[PDB]
Every structure is written in C-alpha cells, then in structure tokens.
Amino acid sequence: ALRGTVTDFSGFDGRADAEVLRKAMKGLGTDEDSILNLLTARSNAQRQQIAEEFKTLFGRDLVNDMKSELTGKFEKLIVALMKPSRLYDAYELKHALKGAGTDEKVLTEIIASRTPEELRAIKQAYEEEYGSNLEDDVVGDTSGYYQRMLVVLLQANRDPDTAIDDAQVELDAQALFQAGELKWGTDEEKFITILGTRSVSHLRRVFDKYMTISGFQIEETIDRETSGNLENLLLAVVKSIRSIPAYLAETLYYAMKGAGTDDHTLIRVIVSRSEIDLFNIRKEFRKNFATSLYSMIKGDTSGDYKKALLLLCGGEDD
Amino acid sequence: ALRGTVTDFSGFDGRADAEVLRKAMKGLGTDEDSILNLLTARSNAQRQQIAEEFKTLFGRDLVNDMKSELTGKFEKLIVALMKPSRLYDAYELKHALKGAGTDEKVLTEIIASRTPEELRAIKQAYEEEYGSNLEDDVVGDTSGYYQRMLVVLLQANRDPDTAIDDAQVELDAQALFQAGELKWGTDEEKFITILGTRSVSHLRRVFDKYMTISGFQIEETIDRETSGNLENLLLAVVKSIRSIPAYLAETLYYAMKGAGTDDHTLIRVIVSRSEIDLFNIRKEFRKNFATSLYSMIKGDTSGDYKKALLLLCGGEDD
Amino acid sequence: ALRGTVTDFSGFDGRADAEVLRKAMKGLGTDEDSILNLLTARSNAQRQQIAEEFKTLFGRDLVNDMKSELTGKFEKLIVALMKPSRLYDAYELKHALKGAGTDEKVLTEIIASRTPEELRAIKQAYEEEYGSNLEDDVVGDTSGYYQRMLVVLLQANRDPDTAIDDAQVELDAQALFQAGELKWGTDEEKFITILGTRSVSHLRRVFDKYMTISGFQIEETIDRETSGNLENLLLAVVKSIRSIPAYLAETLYYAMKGAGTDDHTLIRVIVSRSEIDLFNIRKEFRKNFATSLYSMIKGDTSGDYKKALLLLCGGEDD
Ligand SMILES: [Ca+2]
Ligand SMILES: [Ca+2]
Ligand SMILES: [Ca+2]
Ligand SMILES: [Ca+2]
Ligand SMILES: [Ca+2]
Ligand SMILES: [Ca+2]
Ligand SMILES: [Ca+2]
Ligand SMILES: [Ca+2]
Ligand SMILES: [Ca+2]
Ligand SMILES: [Ca+2]
Ligand SMILES: [Ca+2]
Ligand SMILES: [Ca+2]
Ligand SMILES: [Ca+2]
Ligand SMILES: [Ca+2]
Ligand SMILES: [Ca+2]
Ligand SMILES: [Ca+2]
Ligand SMILES: [Ca+2]
Ligand SMILES: [Ca+2]
Ligand SMILES: [Ca+2]
Ligand SMILES: [Ca+2]
Ligand SMILES: [Ca+2]
C-alpha cells in the first residue's frame, strides 16, 4: 500500500561507492554529478554504510568532506540525505526549537503527520542525540492550546483502530458541534481530546457524520472557530487523519506555489518521506493539483539541487 | 508479615480519574477535597497512570497543575504522593545534600532504615535522575566516622542471614565490649565493621549477648561512647536492626511530640512507607506510645493536609 | 600462545587482603612493602574485589587512601595497577589528549598495538567514562595524514585473516612500491589504506614480497619517504603487524636506554600488558637486546617502585 521512491540498490558494494565519492572530491574542484547520481540511488541505510567504508579506507569523515566541497541548497539537500533516517525528524524538530524564533510550521507538520509508532521513535532518538526531553523543549517554546494539542499528540497514545461503534460516532460528532458552532466562543479542550486521542478510523467516520449534522466540513468549522497556530495544527491533524500522503502533498504544493520556493520544506518532505510514502504523495499531488510533483519541482528549482530532487522524486509522467 | 496502608484500587479507571482531577481544578478555585479523596485512595503506580491519562486527554502536566492550584503543607504532601515510589527516597536524599546546609537527619533516617535491596535501587535511581553518584555526593558533604559508616551502609553488602554461629556471637559481643566500655576512648572502626556488615539476625543475637556480658544495652554504650552525628547514626542502625517499623514509629513520634511538628519528616515517613510497612509502624507506635498514630496526627495537623494524612494512615481505633 | 606474568591468586580472600592493606596504612607511616607484595600478587579483577571489600569493611576508598599514603613513581605505579583493566587504555588516551600539549607517542603506541577487538572495547569504555567520543577527541587534537591513519585504525575494521591470495599480495606490494619509492613525493593515502585495512596475515606476506621486489624492508621505505608523527605511526603499525610483543619490547627498550627513564611508558607497558602478553614481551626483549627485561629495569629504577616493577615482570633468569 505505502510505497517510497528510494529503495536499496541491488548489488551494493559500499567500498566501491566510497572510492567513487573520494575520486569525486579529491583535488581541485568537485564532481557534483557523480555525487548526486550515486547518493540518490542508494537507500538511507546504504548511505550510512558508504560513510563507514569511506572512513575505514581514508580516515576522513564523508559528510564533513562533502560539507567542505558543496555549497548552497545542494549542500543542504545532501546533508539531509546523509542524516540516518532514525534521527532526521528529531534533527528537524531540534532545529525548529529556538525560543522566540521557533519555527511552528515544522513542529506542526511533523507532529501532526507522524504516527504514534513514529513519534515514540522520534522522542527516543531526540533524547539520545540531544540529551533533552522533546516534550520539555516543546513546552518551553510554545504556549496556549497550541502547546496543549502538541503535548497530547506527543503522548503517542491515540486509541487503536478497532471495530466502529456508531453511537460513539454520533456522540463525538454532536460533541464537536456543541463545542464549536453552537457555543459562544469555543471549547478547545473538547476538540483537542477528540481529535488528539480517538482512533484514525473512528475520526474519519466522525468527520462524515459531523458534515451530515452541521452542513460544514470539520475544516470549515476549524477556520470559523479558531485562528493562528492552533488553527494550523488542527487543520494539519484533520488532514493527516484523512490522508497523510494528501496532507504532505498539499504541504509540498504550498512550498512551491508563488514567488520562489520554501526550500527547507521541500527538502524535508522529499527526504523524510523518500522511503515511506513519497510514491503515494506523488499520486495525491497529481490527483489534487493536475500537475506532476516532478514538473513543479522542475519549474521551481535550479542546478544540481534540482537534478538531485528530481532523481529522488521520479514520476516524470505522473 | 509487612503490610502497607495503601493498596491498588479495585476497578481502577485512570481516564475517569484524570477527568475528575481536571474538573477539580478547572476554572476559578480548586476542589481540594476531591483531589485528596481520590489520590489517597490510589496506589503510587495508579497515580502515575492517572498522570499519563491526564496528559493524554488534556495536554497538561498533572503535577505542574496541582503545584499551581495547591499551597502550603497540603501541596508538599501531594507532590510527595505523586513522586514515583522508585524515585522518592533518592529525591529526599538529593534534597538533603546541600554543602554546609546538609540535612544529616534525612541521610541517617533513610540510609539506616532501608534494606540492602532498597539501597541498591536507590543508588541506581539517584544516578539516573541526577547524573551524580550518591556515594560521591554523600562523601562530599559529610566527614569523619559518620561519613565512613554511611559509606559502609551504602555498599549494601551486609552479610546474608544464615544459620547462627554461637561462637561468632560471643566473639563479636566481646569485641564490642573491648572496643567501647573497656577502652580509653573508642575504637569506632570496630563498631562500624560489626554493625555495618554483619547480618541482621546475627546482630540481634549479638545485642542480647552484649547485654549479658556488659550489663548495658548496646544503645546505652553508644550514648556513653559517642556523640553528635555518629551517635545518631549508630542508634538508628541498631534500632533498625531490632525493628525497622519500630525505628520509624519512633521517628514519627519525635516529629510530632512538642511545640509544633516536623512536617517534612511526617510527610516523608508516611508517604515512603505507605505501601511497605506503615501498618506495622502503626502497630509499633500504639504499643510503644499508648496513643494511636492517627490521634497524634489528628492533634498535630490542620486542614486538607490533616485530612489527607489521616486517610493515608488509617487506624482510627488502633 | 600469548601469556601474561600476573594471574589470579589461588585461595584469594578479598576481605583478608583488605584487612592487610588497612593495617599497612593505619596510623603514622606506611608499610609500602606489604602493599606492593600483595597488590603485585593479585590479578586486576582481584584488586577490584579487594577495593570493594575495603570500602565495605571500613567505609574508606582504597585508592584514595593509597594516594594519601604513597608518593612519587611508586604512587603512580600503584594507581595504574588499581585502574580496572577495561578502563586503563582509555585512561591513558584521555590523559594524552590535551590540545597543543598532546602526547602523540601514547596515541601512536596504543592505537597501533591494540587489536580491533581491543579498540572496540576501548572506544566504548572511553565514551562511558568521559562522556566524549574518542574519535572526535583524537581528530580535535591531531592533523594531517597522522590524524587520518589514526582514524582508520580507530574504525577497528581491519580485514579478517582468511586464506592468502598470492596475486593480491603481489598487487599490494607493487602498489606500495609505486606509491613510495617510484613516486616523486609520496601517495600517503595508498599506504594508509593498505597498512590500515588489510589483514595481519596478508600484510606479513606483503612485507616479504615488498622486500623481494624493491630490495628495501618496508620500514626502510617509510623512513625514506616520510617523517614526523606519520613516520612514527607507520613504523609502529608495521612493527605491530610483525609482532605486537616485539613492538612493545622495543618500546620498553627505548624507554630505559640512555639518560634516565621514560617512567610513564615503563609503567604503562608493564601494567597494560601484565595479563596479556608480558611474558612474550620478555622473550622478545631477551632475543633482541641480549639482556633480560628484569636486569634493565633493575638497573634503571629505585626503591619500592623498582621492587614492584620487578615483581610484576619476573624473569630473573630470562
Ligand atoms: Ca575537491
Ligand atoms: Ca564542479
Ligand atoms: Ca559548504
Ligand atoms: Ca463558537
Ligand atoms: Ca471560548
Ligand atoms: Ca480563522
Ligand atoms: Ca515558486
Ligand atoms: Ca482552578
Ligand atoms: Ca477550595
Ligand atoms: Ca503552589
Ligand atoms: Ca571507652
Ligand atoms: Ca578514641
Ligand atoms: Ca552521647
Ligand atoms: Ca506537636
Ligand atoms: Ca598511615
Ligand atoms: Ca614506610
Ligand atoms: Ca600521594
Ligand atoms: Ca617517493
Ligand atoms: Ca607527495
Ligand atoms: Ca624520515
Ligand atoms: Ca636509563
């Protein structure tokens, strides 16, 4: 069902690859083409083995050498590709967490779209890597119901998918109606408990029943009742419940539509999802925006950066 | 044989309880009665689950919210009740360790009265929680034979209880007599080795034989030969060897007898022992002081603090 | 095949030994003879148990007490003997790593002469003890091809010994000839890959074939082509490949030959190897320098220090 666009290279020889990369950087100048052709054709785990063979053969750190030879958005993409998959989301969160400068978009995007199993692993990686508790750091740099909903999601304690109870679907749809549209102001607490903790399959049914009862999609109510970071988080949670690939496809769309490109977001989504569901993302992107993800990247980016992204994405004729 | 006064609540529903606690704190004011009635009727492990459900439902930290709503001795008691049992003794030790301000009474009380199995667990919890070695911190803030005896006990290497060797009982009783009463000055080293390392059952016999030989109880010799912190520690060790519940009952007695109350000690003993031997402690208290622990607490304390302590203790008609 | 000079004492009683050591230090003055006779006759693991029994009996730290009673080179030797074997090499490396003051001789000696299995264990011990990554610290305080070769060795990824391929022996011997003697300047990279990563048994054959082709021993080429720290490291690697005991015997020889003694090196080699191959080292020493290691130590050292070293080494009539 879920498919990435990068898989293990058949006939992999990490030592041969390390030699190719050394040759690409040795002496004056840099062969960026050899680097991007190789690294985009190896899985993350294979990149780690290449880095180990490179240090064994040459006593040099592969990532440090590439940071010395490469520049600009290409360098940023290559660095992202070399982060072990188990650490990459933690790395992005750590870098989003910076006091008044906190990048809420990143916190929202990752925490809303990762499964409880993924969040458990991220929390552990973050603690091991940075010596800090993710929840503590998030709490320190956020406030209000936005913080509260993030903490709920960080518990990674969403109800498991089990048989649907129709009376429970009715009760929760009515509860949301009473907490929002029928209330002067908003009972955010009720929204957070229901959206944060009920099972995915249960909530998909609640969203349909809510539309039946109220005449609004839950996303319309959220825009009507809330604003600011809480609004963006609740929408990301609802969209992820409906379809993580669709939510991430939408995220890529907005990173590219308009003047320039949100390169940070483009790199993060493509790299983080490349071995999970980037294929599904391409399919949702084409369905919803009548263009290929490929053509939009092709139009928005330049140089070796563009070339590497296109190889990672694929789907020329999506 | 050993019985606490708090046990797991039958029919426990952590999510229901979390909702009750939220309702108790939500909005202006605080329902302290609902909080103390619930938390004193749940075991420590159940309190931890309640805290997890509360954060899952509401994205709020239960202990932090209670610290915001509560005040005074009641707050201090509730905070103590919410500490995981596996960390509580380590927490009290950490807080006793403060340079010139070191609270020797706490070091003595805990280290003398905990079993080797308990001390092994405390040492590990302390290291994990605080990133420091307990023995190192104790050494830094104590000196002299007091320090040495604490280090001996911290090794948690007391001889196991095995069949009693009567000639060994004679030898050790005579050794103690020669090291103290018959010596100009005192051979503290000999007292520390024998009291610190021999088995409990062996030492109970040595104490009786020592009385036979010398005409003094070992506690009388200790008062005659030593003073200061070393005296208090040796007495706590001997009393704990005779009966941990009796030693702790005596500790509670002195925390309350006289002007006011040592509230810190009252909270620590009641909470730390509530699921181990607080029932035995009540029994020893009644035996030795002709009053119930309940009535003494009832007489010495006020308000919600008093109410919560009484529910934890029980034994109205001891 | 490999034999130390110190082994477990038969009939070991750690508690009896702890009492002997206490008696040696108790009161004014110190019985250095009782200390050195006992500790040199116990294995490292037995010394650790003695330290534990000493703290259990007396509440005193054995190593700290000995640091208080002893002085000079004797103290330094006793401290080295008490370090757990699993930490000693890490301890020496940590102490060699000091910015501009870095002791390259120690880095070279340990990293060249330890097996991949040993280096894996050292890296782990270092990280656990000091909270730092050994490779990172080495990189910070070294530079150039010297650093690179150290990093290669630190990977502990040397090819396993397997059946010898004669054509591979020819290829590598010719490669080294082309990289050094036939090249204007030197291809250090090629030397580092081959010497750092090929199997020991393969390299022993390459060294013989290299002599056949070039008329030089590889050590002669290294002196002809390189200098400085890289030279010393490549020679230590080649000598260790030929024979670790021989390399370490040579290291001891130079620590003593000439005005005075390199006491730090003498202590490190004797203690670190005492339970691994110090017997083989003695044999190589006698073979290569026509004197006993014993007689050279006897001639170069004084006092209790001399006595303890001689007991550790043995081999009076080597
Ligand atoms: Ca280059
Ligand atoms: Ca170029
Ligand atoms: Ca760069
Ligand atoms: Ca409303
Ligand atoms: Ca409102
Ligand atoms: Ca809005
Ligand atoms: Ca654009
Ligand atoms: Ca309130
Ligand atoms: Ca109130
Ligand atoms: Ca408060
Ligand atoms: Ca006396
Ligand atoms: Ca005295
Ligand atoms: Ca006294
Ligand atoms: Ca009182
Ligand atoms: Ca002395
Ligand atoms: Ca002396
Ligand atoms: Ca000294
Ligand atoms: Ca040359
Ligand atoms: Ca050159
Ligand atoms: Ca030279
Ligand atoms: Ca000399």
From Swiss-Prot, chains A, B, C:
The keyword Ribonucleoprotein does not apply. SMART domains: ANX. The modification N6-acetyllysine is found at residues 67, 73, 76, 94, 98. The modification Phosphoserine is found at residue 34. The modification N-acetylalanine is found at residue 1. GO terms for biological process: blood coagulation; cellular response to gonadotropin-releasing hormone; cellular response to lead ion; negative regulation of blood coagulation; negative regulation of prolactin secretion; positive regulation of apoptotic process; regulation of flagellated sperm motility; response to calcium ion. Belongs to the annexin family. This is Annexin A5. It comes from Rattus norvegicus.
